[PDB]
């Protein structure tokens, strides 16, 4: 089983390793033994479906600061912290007209997501590890 001998379009044999031609079948079998042939041979989903949604009534406490939202949530009894994310109003269940603003929504696993619309372009940062905190001793979420 030589992977170098191939058949051309003229009824001949072609050695692609040494790039040689052979007319008859007796010259292709005798071309494997030699110096040039030896030289050429030597050179070469589950977390989203199991999440219960009862949708409780959330209560946020917004306050205009100057140099911040305080979301009161019940005890979740888990290590999963509620995460906040800023999205656009272009994607919705009914898609209302004149929706050209952004909404920052905070979501938890046993609770429902609370969203607040921001008419301004950029006045704060919606990052999780930058300006957010979640005290599990009092179960209080803050974001500024």
């Amino acid at each position: 089983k030589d992977p170098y001998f191939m058949k051309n379009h003229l009824g001949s044999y072609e050695c692609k390793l040494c790039l040689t031609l052979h007319n008859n079948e007796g010259s292709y079998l005798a071309h494997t033994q030699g110096k040039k042939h030896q030289t050429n041979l030597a050179r070469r989903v589950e977390v989203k479906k199991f999440v219960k949604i009862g949708r409780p009534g959330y209560k946020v406490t917004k306050q205009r600061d100057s140099e911040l939202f305080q979301i009161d949530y019940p005890e979740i009894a888990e290590g999963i912290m509620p995460r906040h994310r800023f999205m656009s109003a272009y994607e919705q269940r009914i898609e209302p007209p004149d929706r050209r603003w952004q909404y920052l929504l905070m979501a938890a696993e046993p609770y429902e997501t609370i969203a607040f619309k921001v008419p301004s372009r950029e006045i704060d940062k919606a990052e999780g590890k930058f300006w957010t905190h979640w005290n599990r001793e009092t179960k209080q979420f803050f974001l500024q």
Partner: peptide, 17 residues
């Protein structure tokens, strides 16, 4: 685990109160 939980939450259930 927090990155797996944040990438699997529903971001379409928006409620303004």
């Amino acid at each position: 685990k927090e990155r797996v939980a944040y990438a699997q939450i529903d971001w379409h259930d928006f409620v303004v109160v």
